[PDB]
Amino acid sequence: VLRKLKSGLERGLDTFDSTIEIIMQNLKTELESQETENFLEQLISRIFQVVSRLTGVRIRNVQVPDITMEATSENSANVLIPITADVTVSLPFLGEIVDLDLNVDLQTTVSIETDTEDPQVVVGECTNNPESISLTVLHSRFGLVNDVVDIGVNLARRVVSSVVEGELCPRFRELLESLDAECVEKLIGESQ
Amino acid sequence: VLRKLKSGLERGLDTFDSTIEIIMQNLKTELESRQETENFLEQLISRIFQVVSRLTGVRIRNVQVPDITMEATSENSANVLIPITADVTVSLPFLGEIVDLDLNVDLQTTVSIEQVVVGECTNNPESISLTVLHSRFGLVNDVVDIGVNLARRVVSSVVEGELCPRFRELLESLDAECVEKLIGES
Ligand SMILES: CCCCCCCC/C=C\CCCCCCCC(=O)O
Ligand SMILES: CCCCCCCC/C=C\CCCCCCCC(=O)O
Ligand SMILES: [Ca+2]
Ligand SMILES: [Ca+2]
Ligand SMILES: [Ca+2]
């Protein structure tokens, strides 16, 4: 069972590693003003390093290729965060059952309230859509068509889904809420 | 890995099921009045393996003793042979049932008259035979090997810890004349 991960996610994975909180604060200050993506790679790696200690799902080599902003209207934009990582699933007695490529696309919206010189920022929902999590099989020492692979892919999906809901989406919203209203207004500007 | 079985074997598997000791006593009385003894042995061994099923994901049932044979080695000594057959299923976490095996175990000890002496009951790995019948995960891949290895270790530790000692204990309960009468059949 993923009991250990479920209890860990209830507490917050940051209760297992003091450095997550520090990286969060580094991201806050950096956002006031290439490097932000580097700080995000660090935050996500450390969260996944804690998941590696609680589960046999080991997620390494975390990259954020490019953070994009697409204007949805004059006063709203989607903020897009593409994540890649290498995944290996291990079970007791069997050791390494499968190596996967992971793609996660986190999306959230920022809006500015219309008809005011003192605009309020609203950050929308961070939806954990199963279509946003992609797992590709690279290798299994048991054979690619073996049933262990399917169990491996399923276990990885559950872990990744639960840490998107429990950690990444909440921190994505928390980091957007740290932006001053003018900064958001300026960034939603020339998203057009 | 097998901690729970190892702790179980140190206590005695009969501390988990009051019926084992009753079946032991049934076998003792039944012997004094020398199929049926084999039926009591099937029951004793099933129950020991029912306890092992509670301590491990190695489930052993359909336990049979085809025929107990005694071959006279001299006028006052014989080899006593007990063939055991059983169906085995190994389960692991997340995978569930990984393999179904056929188990054959051949226990051998000697009984002599001095005073009855029962010889050692040797746990030879050649005396435990495990045959693959079915696997969800392929017949010759590494899942099966892990399954067969776990079953061997469990069966080996239960032979050493429970079956061989009970085999010796039951033979040592026979009086000298009983053994002389049974060796009577070379
Ligand atoms: C665990 C995931 C946390 C994600 C936190 C994201 C915080 C950063 C948010 C917004 C950055 C500003 C948008 C930049 C748009 C310009 C385009 C570019 O940078 O290439
Ligand atoms: C766990 C194993 C315990 C074994 C206890 C040993 C019991 C042996 C009993 C009697 C031996 C007499 C053998 C005579 C041959 C004919 C018997 C027969 O085949 O039915
Ligand atoms: Ca650290
Ligand atoms: Ca498959
Ligand atoms: Ca949380």
Residue numbers in the entry:
A (entry chain A): 38 to 70, 80 to 238
B (entry chain B): 38 to 71, 80 to 159, 166 to 237
Can I see the authors' text?
Further investigation of BSP30 revealed that it is a mixture of two closely related proteins—BSP30a and BSP30b, sharing 83% amino acid identity, with expression restricted to salivary tissue. Notably, BSP30a and BSP30b are abundantly expressed in the salivary gland independently of one another and the proteins are secreted into saliva, accounting for 15–30% of the total protein in bovine saliva. From a structural point of view, the PLUNC protein family belongs to the TULIP (tubular lipid-binding) superfamily. Each molecule consists of 7 α helices and 6 β strands as well as connecting turns and loops, which constitute the conserved TULIP fold.
We have also solved the structure of BSP30b in complex with oleic acid which shows that the hydrophobic channel can sequester one molecule after co-crystallization. The only structure that revealed elongated stretches of electron density within the hydrophobic tunnel was the complex between BSP30b and oleic acid. The hydrophobic end of oleic acid is buried in the tunnel and its carboxyl group stretches out from the tunnel’s opening, forming hydrogen bonds with the carboxyl group of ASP112 and the carbonyl group of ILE113. We suggest that the hydrophobic tail of oleic acid first “glides” into the internal cavity, driven by multiple hydrophobic interactions, while its carboxyl group stretches out and is stabilised by forming hydrogen bonds with the proximate amino acids. We also observe that the overall structure of BSP30b and its internal cavity remain almost completely unchanged upon binding of the lipid ligand, suggesting that the internal cavity of BSP30b also forms a rigid scaffold for its lipid ligands. Only the helix α3 moves slightly away. One of these sites is occupied to a greater extent than the other and a refinement of the occupancy for the binding site of the dominant ligand showed 80% occupancy for this molecule. From our BSP30b-oleic acid structure, it is obvious that, unlike the changes proposed for SPLUNC1, no major conformational change is needed for lipid binding.
